[PDB]
């Protein structure tokens, strides 16, 4: 489907170093437009999800060999068998977003990590993506929102369309602030909104405001069904972190951003 990829694990008590190797990966999808992709793997130890390792990229070709060799030196045992060697391969692209291939992950504690051994695992894997702007005005204490369309919505009325409206709420803290909504358009997977909603927010709560935007299938005589969300804030998903950091980063001015719902 997505590919497969070979890599190794153990463990040295000796040195208490826990080792890694991605060695190649074979069959990985195509995600340039050339029939081919620049496959890297992202490495990481969870829950820890904040240092994380890279392969290098590997431009055109299908089947890479990396045969990179990544350590995790000063791991008591106890404590690897808790985490999860959590493998991501994606597809490099020098002026866009990186293209998520497949990923892959494997409980420590079911492994014999006492000896080095090599694992062949099956690179594993929509509800549509919205398009919308931030803008940050700090000495008009606001935030504009501009909720402009979507694309390749999930269909929810067993018909096989949707009737699609998003709703915007403001968040402080945990409490809920204040609650937009846009007009429904209806039989649309990829519909043009075109609103705009600003929220005044003083300073001091800036860092923790969050905006969720709920992205609604309208379904008259029955309870409305969700298409998918996104949450804007300091901490959300990386691409949502990054929006809001644009915002914040460069204020006054408008930033606009496709956001994957969830
Ligand atoms: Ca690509
Ligand atoms: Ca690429
Ligand atoms: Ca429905
Ligand atoms: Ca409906």
């Given at each position: 489907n997505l590919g497969r990829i070979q890599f190794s694990v153990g463990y040295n008590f000796q040195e208490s170093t826990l080792t890694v190797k991605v060695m190649k990966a074979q069959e990985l999808p195509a995600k340039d437009?050339?029939?081919?992709?620049?496959?890297?793997?992202?490495?990481?130890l969870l829950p820890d999800k904040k240092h994380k390792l890279e392969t290098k990229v590997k431009r055109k070709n299908?089947?890479?060999?990396?045969?990179?060799?990544?350590?995790?030196?000063?791991?008591?045992?106890?404590?690897?068998?808790?985490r999860i060697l959590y493998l991501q391969v994606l597809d490099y692209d020098r002026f866009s977003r990186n293209d998520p291939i497949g990923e892959v992950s494997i409980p420590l504690n079911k492994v014999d990590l006492t000896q080095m051994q090599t694992f062949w695992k099956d690179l594993k894997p929509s509800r549509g993506e919205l398009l919308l702007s931030l803008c940050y005005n700090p000495s008009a204490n606001?935030?504009?929102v501009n909720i402009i369309k979507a694309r390749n919505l999930k269909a929810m009325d067993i018909g096989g369309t949707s009737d699609p409206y998003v709703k915007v709420w403001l968040?402080?803290?945990?409490?809920?602030?204040?609650?937009?909504?846009?007009?429904?358009?209806?039989?649309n997977l990829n519909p043009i909104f075109n609103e705009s909603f600003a929220f005044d927010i003083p300073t001091e709560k800036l860092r923790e405001t969050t905006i969720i935007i709920t992205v609604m299938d309208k379904?008259?005589?029955?309870?409305?069904?969700?298409?998918?969300?996104?949450?804007?804030?300091w901490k959300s998903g990386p691409?949502?972190?990054?929006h809001w950091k644009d915002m914040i980063a460069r204020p006054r001015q408008p930033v606009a951003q496709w956001h994957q719902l969830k």
């Open positions: 437009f050339s029939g081919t992709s620049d496959p890297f793997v992202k490495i990481y299908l089947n890479p060999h990396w045969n990179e060799t990544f350590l995790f030196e000063g791991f008591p045992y106890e404590k690897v068998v808790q606001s935030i504009i968040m402080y803290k945990d409490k809920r602030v204040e609650k937009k909504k846009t007009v429904t358009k209806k039989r379904d008259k005589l029955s309870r409305n069904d969700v298409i998918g969300k996104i949450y804007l804030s691409g949502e972190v990054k």
